[PDB]
């Protein structure tokens, strides 16, 4: 189990770790988060008490270094940093644990929620979507726009998701216009899976990462990307049987985890109604359709 120590908590902030969150008061003796499960990516995110605008946070993997948080009073945010002196870091952490000034990552033993949300998410792929190569961790916030959004303005601070556009020369073979537009299998399997992503694990990883940025930061272009990657599968007549089964599981846990009160904005009525009731794969998402109909029957 790993640890993300905090230098201090100078400003009142709600701190999130994965799907957990807790309130820290201004100048409360908080010095970080312990017992973080190794083997998964994680995200630690922040919303200031004073300005609910700008949720922001850091994707990280504790196997890739020793990381800590320290407030910056000039830039006004909790920053993630790497400590390269490992003896210094162990000593700092051990002191903070002895004085019990850390919250414990509160994973219930029965609980596979985080695993199921991050199954295919790799830190190495995150870092290609979020370009900031000097750091091992990746910053995201509410306002970051996607590469495709900028096509329709600062490139260094963009989310470089894979561009998907159903009315593009990439999606549509000359001579197969009606075929390729009504049955996107060519685009999914040849262009995207074989051409760009290489395998469905990398595809599902981007999809899961887009959902999580949408949910934790209300990042609107992430939500667009999540829905686009769902729709491309559902609108393909020919999808590997194992991909459909795994998609159903993926979506099931995203819908289960979504806050009930955020459904109105984070869920696109047209994509979901199409995918569950009209698409080629309308009969292939049994778990997702059952939880959708029992939790958000209004959207449908």
């Amino acid at each position: 189990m790993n640890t993300v120590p905090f230098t201090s908590a100078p400003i009142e902030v709600t701190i999130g770790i994965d799907q957990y969150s807790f309130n820290v008061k201004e100048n409360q003796p908080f010095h970080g988060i312990k017992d973080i499960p190794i083997g998964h990516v994680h995200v630690i995110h922040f919303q200031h008490a004073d300005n609910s605008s700008m949720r922001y946070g850091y994707w990280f993997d504790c196997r890739m270094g020793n990381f800590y948080i320290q407030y910056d009073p000039k830039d006004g945010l909790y920053k993630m940093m790497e400590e390269r002196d490992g003896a210094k870091f162990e000593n700092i952490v051990h002191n903070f644990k002895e004085r019990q000034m850390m919250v414990s990552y509160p994973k219930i033993d029965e609980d596979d929620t985080w695993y199921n949300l991050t199954e295919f998410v790799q830190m190495d792929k995150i870092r290609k979507i979020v370009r900031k190569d000097e750091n091992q961790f990746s910053y995201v916030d509410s306002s970051m726009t996607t590469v495709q959004e900028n096509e329709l303005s600062d490139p260094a601070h963009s989310l470089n998701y894979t561009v998907i556009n159903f009315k593009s020369r990439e999606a549509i073979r000359p001579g197969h216009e009606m075929e390729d537009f009504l049955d996107k299998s060519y685009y999914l399997n040849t262009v995207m899976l074989q051409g760009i992503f290489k395998n469905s694990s990398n595809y599902f990883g981007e999809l899961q990462f887009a959902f999580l940025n949408a949910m934790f930061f209300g990042n609107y272009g992430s939500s667009l990307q999540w829905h686009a990657m769902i729709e491309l599968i559902c609108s393909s007549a020919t999808v590997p049987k194992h991909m459909l089964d795994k998609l159903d599981e993926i979506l099931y846990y995203q819908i289960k985890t979504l806050p009930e009160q955020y459904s109105d904005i984070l869920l696109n009525e047209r994509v979901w109604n199409i995918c569950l009731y009209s698409s080629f794969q309308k009969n292939s998402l049994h778990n997702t359709e059952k939880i959708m109909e029992n939790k958000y029957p209004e959207l449908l």
Partner: peptide
């Protein structure tokens, strides 16, 4: 949509 796609 049919015309848009044929005129890409």
């Amino acid at each position: 949509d049919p015309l848009e796609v044929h005129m890409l």
